[PDB]
Design a protein around this motif. Structure first.
Motif, PDB file in Angstrom:
ATOM      1  N   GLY A   1       0.912  -1.282   0.078  1.00 51.55           N
ATOM      2  CA  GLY A   1       0.205  -0.208   0.146  1.00 51.55           C
ATOM      3  C   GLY A   1       0.796   1.262  -0.200  1.00 51.55           C
ATOM      4  N   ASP A   2       2.118   0.881  -0.440  1.00 55.61           N
ATOM      5  CA  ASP A   2       3.120   2.240  -0.092  1.00 55.61           C
ATOM      6  C   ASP A   2       3.134   2.594  -1.900  1.00 55.61           C
ATOM      7  N   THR A   3       3.384   4.241  -1.718  1.00 54.28           N
ATOM      8  CA  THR A   3       3.511   4.911  -2.544  1.00 54.28           C
ATOM      9  C   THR A   3       4.909   4.703  -3.796  1.00 54.28           C
ATOM     10  N   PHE A   6       4.512   1.731  -4.929  1.00 56.20           N
ATOM     11  CA  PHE A   6       4.227   1.640  -6.488  1.00 56.20           C
ATOM     12  C   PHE A   6       4.806   2.108  -7.740  1.00 56.20           C
ATOM     13  N   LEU A   9       6.756   0.102  -9.422  1.00 55.35           N
ATOM     14  CA  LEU A   9       6.384  -0.831 -10.458  1.00 55.35           C
ATOM     15  C   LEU A   9       6.212  -0.485 -11.232  1.00 55.35           C
ATOM     16  N   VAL A  13       7.473  -2.115 -14.821  1.00 56.27           N
ATOM     17  CA  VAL A  13       6.431  -2.425 -16.106  1.00 56.27           C
ATOM     18  C   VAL A  13       6.653  -1.799 -17.456  1.00 56.27           C
ATOM     19  N   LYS A  28      -4.338   3.815 -16.835  1.00 55.20           N
ATOM     20  CA  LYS A  28      -4.861   4.979 -16.515  1.00 55.20           C
ATOM     21  C   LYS A  28      -4.650   4.878 -14.926  1.00 55.20           C
ATOM     22  N   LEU A  29      -4.155   6.255 -14.735  1.00 52.01           N
ATOM     23  CA  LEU A  29      -3.562   6.092 -13.031  1.00 52.01           C
ATOM     24  C   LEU A  29      -3.723   7.648 -12.843  1.00 52.01           C
ATOM     25  N   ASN A  30      -3.304   7.948 -11.781  1.00 45.87           N
ATOM     26  CA  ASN A  30      -3.859   9.185 -11.179  1.00 45.87           C
ATOM     27  C   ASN A  30      -2.463   9.149  -9.833  1.00 45.87           C
TER      28      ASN A  30
END
Ligand SMILES: [Ca+2]
Ligand SMILES: [Ca+2]
Ligand SMILES: [Ca+2]
Ligand SMILES: [Ca+2]
Lengths: 99, 98
Positions: A1-3, A6, A9, A13, A28-30
């Motif tokens: 649950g860590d930014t 994230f 990752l 990708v 799609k992301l924010n």
């Protein structure tokens, strides 16, 4: 649950996409990236184009993959203060190109 | 490597179900074993499976609310030894009402 994890990752990708393990993708992301993270994401493209529309940038980054193969990365973002980039979308496409 | 690559695909789905990844698609050609495929899909509320010419598409639903749900589509070819060649994974948002 860590930014941080994230963003790591997301960078991975893109790496896997450039390796052609991920052939193509879109997400799609924010999420808001530090300049260092944004630079890590994009690497050293062989070509780039950057277009601004309604306060949003879509950049297209091209990477020579193999003899006729090119990898293209599209990053849609908003430029924030203190050199931050809110990423809204990332898309990876393959293209055949003349050598 | 491949075990690490498969761990990432699993985590992409995880992030999608958390809504950090709002929606996504990936085109792929990689073989998951049974355990990896199970972990990838996690715990859907319902599932559908269709086959066309030897290619399977499973649709998984994960209810978020009364109206909202996440859907995961996995396209694959079944292989001997309970292995699955995954060709695409797609995560979308769907709603009950128009
Ligand atoms: Ca990179
Ligand atoms: Ca050639
Ligand atoms: Ca030439
Ligand atoms: Ca509608």
């Amino acid at each position: 649950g860590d930014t941080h994890e994230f963003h790591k990752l997301l960078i991975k990708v893109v790496d896997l996409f450039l390796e052609d393990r991920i052939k193509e993708f879109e997400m799609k992301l924010n999420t808001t990236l530090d300049e260092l993270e944004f630079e890590e994401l994009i690497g050293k493209p062989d070509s780039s184009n950057s277009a601004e529309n309604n306060g949003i940038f879509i950049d297209e980054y091209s990477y020579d993959a193999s003899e006729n193969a090119m990898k293209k990365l599209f990053v849609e973002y908003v430029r924030q203060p203190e050199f931050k980039y809110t990423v809204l979308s990332i898309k990876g496409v393959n293209d055949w190109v003349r050598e």
